[PDB]
Amino acid sequence: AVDASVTSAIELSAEQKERITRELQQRYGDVHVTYHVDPTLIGGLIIRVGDQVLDNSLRARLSAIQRVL
C-alpha cells in the first residue's frame, strides 16, 4: 500500500517515472517510489508495493533455464 519500488535495467524513464508514480495510486493511495538500475538485470519488470512483487523479465528467463535443466 506504501513504500513502493520499481527497478529496471534502463533507468531515467523521465515522464514514465512520473506516470508510474501517479498510476501506482490504483491500490489505496500515496506511494513512495524508489528506482534502481541493477545492470545484471536484463529487463525491468520488478514492481513492489507493500508485501507483494511482480517480475517476469529475469524470471521468464529463470523459468526457461529451470525448464531446460
Binding site: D38, T40, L45, R48, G50, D51, Q52, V53, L54, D55, N56, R59, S63, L69
Partner: protein
Amino acid sequence: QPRQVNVGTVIAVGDGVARLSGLDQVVASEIVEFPPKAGRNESIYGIALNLEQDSVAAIILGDDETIEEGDMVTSTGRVISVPVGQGLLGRVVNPLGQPIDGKGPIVYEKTRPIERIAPGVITRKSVDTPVQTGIIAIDALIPIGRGQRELIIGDRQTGKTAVAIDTILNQKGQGMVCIYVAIGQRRAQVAQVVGTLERFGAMEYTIVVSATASESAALQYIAPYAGCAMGEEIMENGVMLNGQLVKDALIVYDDLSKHAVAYRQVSLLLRRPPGREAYPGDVFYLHSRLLERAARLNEEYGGGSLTALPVIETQANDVSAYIPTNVISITDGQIYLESDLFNAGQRPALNVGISVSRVGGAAQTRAMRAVAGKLKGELAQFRDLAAFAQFASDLDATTKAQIERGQRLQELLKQPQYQPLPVEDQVAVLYAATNNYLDDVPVPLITKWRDDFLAFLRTAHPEVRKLIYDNRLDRKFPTPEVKEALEAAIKEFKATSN
C-alpha cells in the same frame, strides 16, 4: 506468466539466522529465497522456523555473510524437498540434493519432501528378514532386522563408523540400498568414507548425504531428514539394482549427537527457551520424527523396508546424558561400543552384556537362531563369572569350564576390519564352537583357527557352504544332510591341521 509472490525485507541477520519482517501468509517450514542481488549471483535459501508476530526468523541454508539488512526475500510456497530416485545411487549430495562429488548433475524425476509423517500405524509388518551385518557379534547376539532402528552408541573413537561401514559393505548382493548420512562430519572424513566404499565397490548401491562441519547449522539440521526421504522412496517405490527391483533401504546417520548439537545451535540462535543441557524442548521430538520413519511396510503397502542405524558418541561413556537417553528410548536396539574393550583386543568392541536388540531372533535366519542361543547363554554365564577367571585359582572344572568356553567364544567374536563374513560362514563357525569341536584349541589361536577353517571351507568344500546357505531358513536347521558334511568338514579340518 507473471504472478504476485509475497515478499518481506530482512531486518536483522546474525549468526546464520535472518529476521524477515513482513512475510504474511508464509507456512511454518517454507523455503524463503533471498533472490540474487549485486555481489551475489545465486540464491541463498532459508527455512522459516519461527513464525512470530511482525517477524519471521528463518535459518539460512548456506553462508549468511552475503545476506544484508534490507534485502528482499520471496516466500516460495514449496516446502523443503530433495531430488530422489534411481539417479542418486553412488552420488555424494548435500542435504538439498545438489551433488558435491563433481560427477555431474543428479538425474531425477521425483522430489519427495523431507519432514514427512511416519509411514503409518497398520501399514507396517513384523520385522522378519535379517540385515546381515557381516560381524559375528552383531549378527549372532544383537541381530538387526530389515526395518529396525538399531543405535550404535559409544565413546569418541571406538568403531561406530567402522561398524556402520562394514554393515554397508556387507550388503553387496543382499538387495539393499544403503544410505550414509554425514552430519557435522569433517569433509576429509566423508572423503575417507567415500574412498573406502569405492574401493570395495560399495558405491554402486550407496547414497552419501553429507552436511559437514563448516556448512551452516541449518543444512546439518535437515541433513538426516534428507536421505531419510531417499530411503523412504526406495522402500516405497524401489530402485533397480543389479537388475532386481530393490525395495529395502538402510540409512546410517553418521552422528545424531552432532545433529542434536546443530539443532541446539539453531534453536538458541532463534532464542527459543532452552531445556536440559541447553538443548531445545523438542529434540526428542526431532529424533523421533526422524527415526519413526524407518519401518517395514506390509505387503499391502509394497512390502519394502527402511532400516536406520543411528550413531551417537558419548562423553566419557556417559550413557545417561540427554541425547543418548533420548535415542536409546527411541530406537529398537542398542549396540554399545567401549574403549576398554576396544583396547583389550575385542576389535568390534561391542559390549554384549548391555547391547540389546528387541527384535531378537525374528531378525535372524533360522540357522542363526538355532546356533546362537547356546552362544548367548554361555557368554552370559562367562560374563557372570568374571573375577574367578582372572585371579581365583581354586576353581573346579565347572566354573573353569565356563570360563574356558566363554573365552573361546569371545575370541571367536574378535574380527578384523573390512572382512565381513556371510551368514553361512558365521553359522559354520558358531556350530563348530558350540558343539565342542573347538574345545582343544588354545585361547590365543582361535582367531587364526577361525580364519583357517574359513579358508578351508572356501577352498576344500564349497558344497557345504552352498548346502548351509540353501537351507538356512528351515525350522530345524541341523538337518542330517547338513549335520553330515559339516561335522565331517570340521573333523577333516581338525585332523589335517594341528
